[PDB]
Design an enzyme around this catalytic site. Sequence first.
Site, mmCIF file in Angstrom:
data_model
loop_
_atom_site.group_PDB
_atom_site.id
_atom_site.type_symbol
_atom_site.label_atom_id
_atom_site.label_comp_id
_atom_site.label_asym_id
_atom_site.label_seq_id
_atom_site.Cartn_x
_atom_site.Cartn_y
_atom_site.Cartn_z
ATOM 1 N N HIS A 88 14.952 15.696 15.817
ATOM 2 C CA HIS A 88 15.620 17.051 16.377
ATOM 3 C C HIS A 88 17.240 16.550 15.936
ATOM 4 O O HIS A 88 17.653 15.442 16.104
ATOM 5 C CB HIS A 88 15.681 16.995 17.856
ATOM 6 C CG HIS A 88 16.504 18.202 18.451
ATOM 7 N ND1 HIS A 88 15.983 19.300 18.531
ATOM 8 C CD2 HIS A 88 17.901 18.091 18.582
ATOM 9 C CE1 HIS A 88 16.797 20.164 19.169
ATOM 10 N NE2 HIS A 88 18.148 19.154 19.154
ATOM 11 N N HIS B 74 13.120 13.666 19.920
ATOM 12 C CA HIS B 74 13.342 14.141 21.140
ATOM 13 C C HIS B 74 12.458 13.689 22.191
ATOM 14 O O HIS B 74 12.117 14.571 23.185
ATOM 15 C CB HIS B 74 13.592 15.670 21.012
ATOM 16 C CG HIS B 74 14.378 16.235 21.815
ATOM 17 N ND1 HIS B 74 14.096 16.400 23.386
ATOM 18 C CD2 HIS B 74 15.527 16.853 21.555
ATOM 19 C CE1 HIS B 74 15.357 17.089 23.797
ATOM 20 N NE2 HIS B 74 16.183 17.353 22.680
ATOM 21 N N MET C 230 7.642 -3.829 7.789
ATOM 22 C CA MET C 230 7.012 -3.948 6.510
ATOM 23 C C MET C 230 6.690 -2.434 6.163
ATOM 24 O O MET C 230 5.400 -2.471 5.787
ATOM 25 C CB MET C 230 6.223 -5.015 5.953
ATOM 26 C CG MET C 230 6.700 -6.382 6.308
ATOM 27 S SD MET C 230 5.614 -7.681 5.485
ATOM 28 C CE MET C 230 6.195 -7.317 3.735
ATOM 29 N N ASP D 1 0.971 -1.200 0.037
ATOM 30 C CA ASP D 1 -0.096 -0.031 -0.121
ATOM 31 C C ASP D 1 1.009 1.161 0.037
ATOM 32 O O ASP D 1 1.840 1.437 0.918
ATOM 33 C CB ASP D 1 -0.707 0.050 1.230
HETATM 34 CU CU LIG Z 1 3.423 -8.353 5.000
HETATM 35 CU CU LIG Z 2 17.712 18.521 23.262
#
Ligand SMILES: [Cu+2]
Ligand SMILES: [Cu+2]
Lengths: 333, 333, 333
Positions: C247, C298, C142, C89
């Site tokens: 971050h 973070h 996956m 998908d």
């Molecule tokens: Cu699968």
């Molecule tokens: Cu930091």
Amino acid sequence: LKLPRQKVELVAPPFVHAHEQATKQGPKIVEFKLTIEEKKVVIDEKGTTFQAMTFNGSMPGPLMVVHEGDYVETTLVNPATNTMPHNIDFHSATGALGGGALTLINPGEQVVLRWKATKTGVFVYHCAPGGPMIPWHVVSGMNGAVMVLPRDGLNDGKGHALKYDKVYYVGEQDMYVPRDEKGNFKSYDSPGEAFTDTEEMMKKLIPSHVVFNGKVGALTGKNALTANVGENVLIVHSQANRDSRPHLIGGHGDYVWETGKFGNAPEVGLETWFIRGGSAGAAMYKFMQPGIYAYVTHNLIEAADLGATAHFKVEGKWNDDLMTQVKAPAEIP
Amino acid sequence: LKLPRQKVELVAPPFVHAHEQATKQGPKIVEFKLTIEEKKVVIDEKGTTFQAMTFNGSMPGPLMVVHEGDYVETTLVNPATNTMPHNIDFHSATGALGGGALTLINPGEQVVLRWKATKTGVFVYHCAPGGPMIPWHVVSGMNGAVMVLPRDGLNDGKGHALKYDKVYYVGEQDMYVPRDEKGNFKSYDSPGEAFTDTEEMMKKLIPSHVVFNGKVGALTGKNALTANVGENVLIVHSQANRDSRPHLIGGHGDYVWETGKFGNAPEVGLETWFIRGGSAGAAMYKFMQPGIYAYVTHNLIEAADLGATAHFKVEGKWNDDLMTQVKAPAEIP
Amino acid sequence: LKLPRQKVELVAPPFVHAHEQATKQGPKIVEFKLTIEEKKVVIDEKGTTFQAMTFNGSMPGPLMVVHEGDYVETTLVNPATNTMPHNIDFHSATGALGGGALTLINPGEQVVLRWKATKTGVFVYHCAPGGPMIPWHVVSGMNGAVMVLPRDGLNDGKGHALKYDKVYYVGEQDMYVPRDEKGNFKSYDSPGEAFTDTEEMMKKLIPSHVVFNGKVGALTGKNALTANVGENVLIVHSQANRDSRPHLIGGHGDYVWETGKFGNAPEVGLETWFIRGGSAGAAMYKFMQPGIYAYVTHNLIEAADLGATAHFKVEGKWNDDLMTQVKAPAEIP
Ligand SMILES: [Cu+2]
Ligand SMILES: [Cu+2]
Ligand SMILES: OC[C@H]1O[C@](O)(CO)[C@@H](O)[C@@H]1O
Ligand SMILES: OC[C@H]1O[C@](O)(CO)[C@@H](O)[C@@H]1O
Ligand SMILES: OC[C@H]1O[C@](O)(CO)[C@@H](O)[C@@H]1O
Ligand SMILES: [Cu+2]
Ligand SMILES: [Cu+2]
Ligand SMILES: [Cu+2]
Ligand SMILES: [Cu+2]
């Protein structure tokens, strides 16, 4: 570096040291001192204790305010009365892990770091010694924020100045206090002694407490935030480790920088905004009605049950056009 | 206040009462009635029960739709057949904790609140009696949303009208149902009796169920959402307590206001958007392909395992330019 | 469909196959092959094992890069050496559940899907067989991402080109490894055998590990990411199931598309950004200082304790204007 020097007297949150918004000053070296304090504190109305580690004795650490292009020169002091090494990392700064790689100090030492304020906004600062100590020092309280203002002050992204009448700094802290077998919170004799149980809990990712200004109810009662009808208030909100969703109950975010950076225009008219863990954001509101407001994270379990509620007490005249009780409670016909 | 009055007949979610987008009407007093119902309901296909508390009998409460500058006059009714006090707080409103401080009613009482719709967008409303009751009433189902449209209808931020062909309201509910020792969900005789176990679970922050429209599978089968290829559908999504990340599987958010406020331009072409706990957001999509779509929160564990999946069934002609199965499944050469 | 065909040789993350940013090419059919591999892997430095399921043998699956209006033709192969059905998908695609409804293949089968790249940005792709298998296949590894570039390359929303010198793909994976009674991580003989314990843990919503590129420390040491001062680096970040807050420690996000879609202008100057579970985002940074940087989520507990840290090693000249250690650690006077 031959620029004028200016000292700042830091003040404890939620207050913010005096500063200009728009300024005619050019770049300066702005001098700050932060003194680390490890201490056992009370964090709730039941008397639960907590092994805190702080910048300047407070959770959060104080808000530092400068302007774009200033140089921020911080003397970080780790007195010999502390037990652990510490450092400081500024998300506003460029290089050396935000400064952390240049500021590691043992008890009995100090260090002086300077960084140029090239990015505007509100930013987290925090301790980050290395490895597993990083999260532990942060969630023990070693975090605050810095605000880097444009020299022309704040604007709405459409050419108009936004000027605040007052600013408050709300630092939110996720805390991890273990419980004993029977279910009571544990107390510890030192931060070191708290570490093993606290780390085990931390890695399960669910805080026992989520507080503003270091304690349940810190920003209530005598210490409620205040305003008057007509006043534009800036609320800086930080969370160094975990997401939050601020909301002013009975108000709005008139102008909100949820990612916290003034190079971006604010969003307008928000109900609830989002502070990413590891960041600071800011919201402005002009009060229109008197009375009590609650300022919360809008996970209401965290707000009401884990600690994360502040109050505003607002003076002025009630506006019946905006809201009115048409019919008071009465028996159903 | 000498304005025309207009009554609205509310309809149960995910449907939305009839309304204009762009309007030539000026401000009105728009009258709504909400009648609180506490009731035990079934929330999953296994027969798990839940002590719900609702506005108008549904989870979420119905969507209220008005225009900027209207006055919203709500009669809130708490029949004597209920057991607890209740109130209502509108995130769209200014003052008195969103109205909560003016609408606390005991069983057997009603109250009438009016507020001026000065902020555009979609907004949460919810009960908020006080203290620990706040989260408990919300996570028991006492939340819905209101939409405040610009009088010129919606726009794309570039001068062009966006007009929806239909709107659906998806209210997402985090539920906290305790388990017994052997691991089965518990049932309770009253909301009061459910409170102690439910609060203990709530403070651990992990829901047992995350559902749309009150129940696993509510928006599937006979009650799937529908559209045709070519139709522009607005999906309003609310979550009064906990974050969500909506996603239309096989589609997109063509125009998305994830923070939910129409004074801000929409973002375009999103895969997944983010509803902050304590807010409503909205996304528009013009369907291009027929068939089944799933509308989920894209924590797929919550979607597939805890309840948070809706379906759309879409009619029309398949577009092989957009997507085609070039070669059906076959043995590897 | 009479367009030129172009084959791509995919490369393992965090690297990205060679591609143009701005192009003079018109639409093509761009051909990719993905071969599914189920395998037991080691995910941490303690030797914890994990029943992984992958596209092309990696976690994340490789980044696919095309331009707007290209047709993406993927041959998905499920060799007979695997045990389960799989599909694919694409969040970038329109119709048939993103392609999942046209690509379900048993072991020993392959399928060919084509979709038109009508939406620009970075997007998740993932397996989604049906029902409870959806989250399980995703959190088993996956998932990957695709980048759909404008034909004129990236821009800043103000008319200026942004050109990256290099791009890295950081795929973040939440993993759920159960523990035995004494608290050690369990090992399993097959994905099927891992399923019951793994599902029970999954529904509690707390990962045991949160890793980049499939393993604690994958993007460190010999495999640190690299740059030079002066280089503009694009970092694509995906998370198919759970939120993240990237971050760059010591840096910034100069230009950030946190929702990941290039029809929207980037935000500027961020400290921390937010990847919604079920999405990809992207951030660009021009390095200004040499040395080690950490790239983290973070939530620092997840970063330091659960696995979610990468490093950059950056070459060049230190800039004392931006940051300097004014006084090295010394005894307090
Ligand atoms: Cu699968
Ligand atoms: Cu930091
Ligand atoms: O408020 C900051 C914003 O305002 C502007 O300067 C003018 O629109 C933008 O360039 C910037 O992103
Ligand atoms: O869609 C709302 C947006 O559209 C505009 O009116 C025109 O660009 C902006 O002022 C507003 O933020
Ligand atoms: O960077 C993408 C953005 O740049 C523009 O093309 C020009 O401002 C916008 O229309 C678009 O949202
Ligand atoms: Cu420290
Ligand atoms: Cu109630
Ligand atoms: Cu609320
Ligand atoms: Cu998906």
